[PDB]
């Protein structure tokens, strides 16, 4: 899922110097919400491996995955890869790495803590709107794990403190808001763990050679297509479409360079706006993403209202938004978009609940006050007077966009090169091919788009010597 990136640096004399590693566009929705036939990250399943009983007993982890809430929603297990030896190899690789085993225990216990936030329960007060907890054993063990106080954590979750003017006031939270806050806290802590791990790996890999001009290597998820496309698939498709639009612009620049070199210059219209028409319907204001971001803020938003607003604001008015289509008894379709890869339909249901990422400030402050390494990852979080963004006003969609932007402002600074890998068949048998799979791979890789862009001009170019020696016999 995450957009791995590696910059291989070189010395002054054009010799290999060292390597740097960065990650981008890591998806957090997979942590809490999973599709019915899909699993979560391999970390949790690997941790539940029974070949290491010490971790299970010292973390007080229930050996039954069904009991826990976060994992049981998705598919429990598949015969994808044996987790036992994979976990053992990962542990060995960490052991032979630069840092000690206390840190490994730290990551394991923090992952266990992330696991237990789902056991939290809250009941609305009989005489008041605010909701208070009912069970506390899970909270007690979790607070013991982070070295925090269960009472303080419960007070913070139930009664977040906020700074107004120069004084602190308490805010009221209902069951839904506290559940969203817990989910956001889990996602944020996981993201910070991953970022800290990446930084540690980069520091360990770092060597003392000078860092001159580098060569980038970028791996990203493809233009995945399902019959049940959802918000995560929408984000992936949008990122892939932006990448394709960049590729189209680069190819156009190369074509113009060749034309000016050869003095054959015509059809100066750039090839970007044609694909950017769909892009402008996603990221720009009044787009689907902006409309969803506003709608999740409205206190009484519902899926039907969101669909009605989309239809009112885009049906007929835009050239890419159109009605959905029903084929072969597809489970559901709400709206369809036209991309470079064809027609893709998405399901609105469930988007609104998972778009919200409201963080809690007081919980972050408590983490910073903790006696564990966790404070390092949550070290900083939220004459001219710039204004920041409120905790409540936090959505996954915006961050994604921001991340994509901070990627494009970097990748555009280097001359790009493209490599495409195509699987020949679904089966392991060599030689045999499945034409539909190759068609899907070609459609998602944008090769058809390249050939279509080439054909509108003059794709066939021949030297006069070859043309003479091959066609002069005609006359």
């Amino acid at each position: 899922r995450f957009g791995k990136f590696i910059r291989i640096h070189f010395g002054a004399t054009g010799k290999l110097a060292s390597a740097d590693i960065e990650t981008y566009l890591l998806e957090k929705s997979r942590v809490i919400f999973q599709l019915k036939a899909e699993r979560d990250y391999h970390i949790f399943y690997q941790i539940l491996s029974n070949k290491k009983p010490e971790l299970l007993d010292m973390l007080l982890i229930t050996n039954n995955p069904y009991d826990y809430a976060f994992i049981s929603q998705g598919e429990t297990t598949v015969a994808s890869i044996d987790d036992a030896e994979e976990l053992m190899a990962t542990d060995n690789a960490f052991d032979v790495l630069g840092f000690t085993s206390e840190e490994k225990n730290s990551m394991y216990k923090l992952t266990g803590a992330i696991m237990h936030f789902g056991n939290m329960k809250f009941k609305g007060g009989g005489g008041g709107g605010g909701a208070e907890p009912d069970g506390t054993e899970e909270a007690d063990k979790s607070a013991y794990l982070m070295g925090l106080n269960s009472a303080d954590l419960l007070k913070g979750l139930c009664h977040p403190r906020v700074k107004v003017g120069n004084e602190y006031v308490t805010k009221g939270q209902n069951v839904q808001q506290v559940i969203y806050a817990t989910g956001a806290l889990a996602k944020a802590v996981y993201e910070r763990m991953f970022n800290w791990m990446v930084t540690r790996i980069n520091a360990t890999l770092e060597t003392k050679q000078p860092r001159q001009y580098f060569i980038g290597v970028l791996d990203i998820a493809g233009f995945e297509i399902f019959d049940f496309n959802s918000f995560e698939q929408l984000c992936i498709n949008f990122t892939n479409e932006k990448l394709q639009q960049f590729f189209n612009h680069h190819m156009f620049v190369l074509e113009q360079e060749e034309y000016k070199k050869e003095g054959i210059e015509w059809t100066f219209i750039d090839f970007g706006m044609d694909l950017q028409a769909c892009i402008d319907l996603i990221e720009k204001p009044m787009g689907i993403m902006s409309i969803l971001e506003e709608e999740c803020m409205f206190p009484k938003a519902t899926d039907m209202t969101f669909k009605a607003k989309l239809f009112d604001n885009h049906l007929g008015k835009s050239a890419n938004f159109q009605k959905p289509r029903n084929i072969k008894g597809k489970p559901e379709a709400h709206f369809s978009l036209i991309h470079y890869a064809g027609i893709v339909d998405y399901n609105i249901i469930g988007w609104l609940q998972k778009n919200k990422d409201p963080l809690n400030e007081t919980v972050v402050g408590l983490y910073q006050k903790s006696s564990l390494k966790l404070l390092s990852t949550l070290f900083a979080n939220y004459g001219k007077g710039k204004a920041k963004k409120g905790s409540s006003f936090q959505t996954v969609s915006a961050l994604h966009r921001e991340n994509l932007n901070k990627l494009m402002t970097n990748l555009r600074s280097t001359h790009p090169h493209f490599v495409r890998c195509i699987i020949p068949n679904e089966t392991k048998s060599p030689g045999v091919m499945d034409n539909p799979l190759v068609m899907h791979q070609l459609r998602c890789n944008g090769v058809l788009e390249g050939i279509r862009i080439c054909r509108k001009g003059f794709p066939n170019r021949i030297l006069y010597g070859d043309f003479r020696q091959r066609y002069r016999i005609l006359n």
Partner: protein, 371 residues
């Protein structure tokens, strides 16, 4: 760019950027002038102290409030307040920040016209909008229906909203507010031996009211208890000494809200105005309004007010209805939170009154559909 949400209110100006969880700047809306001569030469005292700074020099200044009940009465003082808010508090240039302003219902049109004219001319704000307190308060409460009672320091008004639709004929306004409560507290403290006259001591009396007053569930029972028991007496420390002890006067000041006849007002108590407003609306939405009663404003921060209001309404309302009162801890800043939420909406970007529209249609443009 980013939007700017400022709430003049009454007795407390609170401003910040849109999308924030709480206003950055909160300070009294007071303008002070020195009343003495001044003998030291070279210090060069300024002729006007504005904002929270005037509190520091409270003892040598004549504090004046630019607004009496919502309506602005001293426009120069209001300009000074706005300049201080924009420059010395937020340290931002309004030349590149749309401004959302809050204004109470049922006010002279000239008030809004002059406000918009000052904003567009003096500060050259690129665009601005004006909203109602009740709608913002409902926005901040995470509700779409219900009747909202906003009681600040200037005016107390009830507005019923159902499914995002207002009921203008059922909007009720009452001039009783926190300032009248402070004046009554002054009038009722003199019977014990303490006299407060100067405008500087207005703040001391207000602080006493905030820190000690509370609403009684029953008036006669509490008075009978205080007539014999002395467990209700509490002491307060003045800024120079001579602590003062108050007994039954602590829970008698807030009773004016439910018993306006104390201060000579003919109208009925807030608990009765709310019920009258509810019965004004259509019969088919009265249950939801009963079940979604919302409170907002600083004056509604007295301990025990929610229970007294619920008891009174239950007494008035039919016995077969569930009366629920929503009193979030952050009543005082609910309006600003609602304004921030409103300004952060994407579909609101086309409702701003741009400079071009004001220039073309003049100051009256405020009274179009861009209400």
């Amino acid at each position: 760019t980013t939007a700017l949400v400022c709430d003049n209110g009454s007795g407390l100006v609170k401003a910040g950027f849109a999308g924030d969880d709480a206003p950055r700047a909160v300070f009294p809306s007071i303008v002070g002038r020195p009343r003495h001569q001044g003998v030291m030469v070279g210090m060069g005292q300024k002729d006007s102290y504005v904002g929270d700074e005037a509190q520091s020099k409270r003892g040598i200044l004549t504090l004046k409030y630019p607004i009496e009940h919502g309506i602005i009465t001293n426009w120069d003082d209001m300009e000074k307040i706005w300049h201080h808010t924009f420059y010395n508090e937020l340290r931002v240039a309004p030349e590149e920040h749309p401004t959302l302003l809050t204004e109470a219902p049922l006010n002279p049109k000239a008030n809004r016209e002059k406000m918009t004219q000052i904003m567009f001319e003096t500060f050259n704000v690129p665009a601005m909008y004006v909203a109602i307190q009740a709608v913002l308060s409902l926005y901040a409460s995470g509700r779409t229906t219900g009747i909202v009672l906003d009681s600040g320091d200037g005016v107390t008004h009830n507005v019923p909203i159902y499914e995002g639709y207002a009921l203008p004929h059922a909007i009720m306004r009452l001039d009783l507010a926190g300032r009248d409560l402070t004046d009554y507290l002054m009038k009722i403290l003199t019977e014990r031996g303490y006299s407060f006259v100067t405008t500087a001591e207005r703040e001391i009396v207000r602080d006493i009211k905030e820190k000690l007053c509370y609403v009684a569930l029953d008036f006669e029972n509490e008075m009978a208890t205080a007539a014999s028991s002395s467990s209700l007496e509490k002491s307060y420390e003045l800024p120079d000494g001579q602590v003062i002890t108050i007994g039954n006067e602590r829970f008698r000041c807030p009773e004016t809200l439910f018993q306006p006849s104390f201060i000579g007002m003919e109208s009925a108590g807030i608990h009765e105005t709310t019920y009258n407003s509810i019965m004004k609306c259509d019969i088919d939405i009265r249950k939801d309004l009963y079940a979604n009663n919302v409170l907002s404003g600083g004056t509604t921060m007295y301990p025990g007010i929610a229970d007294r209001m619920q008891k009174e309404i239950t007494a008035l309302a039919p016995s077969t209805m569930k009366i629920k009162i929503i009193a979030p801890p952050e009543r005082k800043y609910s309006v600003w939170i609602g304004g921030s939420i409103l300004a952060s909406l994407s579909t609101f970007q086309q409702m701003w009154i741009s400079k071009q529209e004001y220039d073309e249609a003049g100051p009256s443009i405020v009274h179009r559909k861009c209400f």
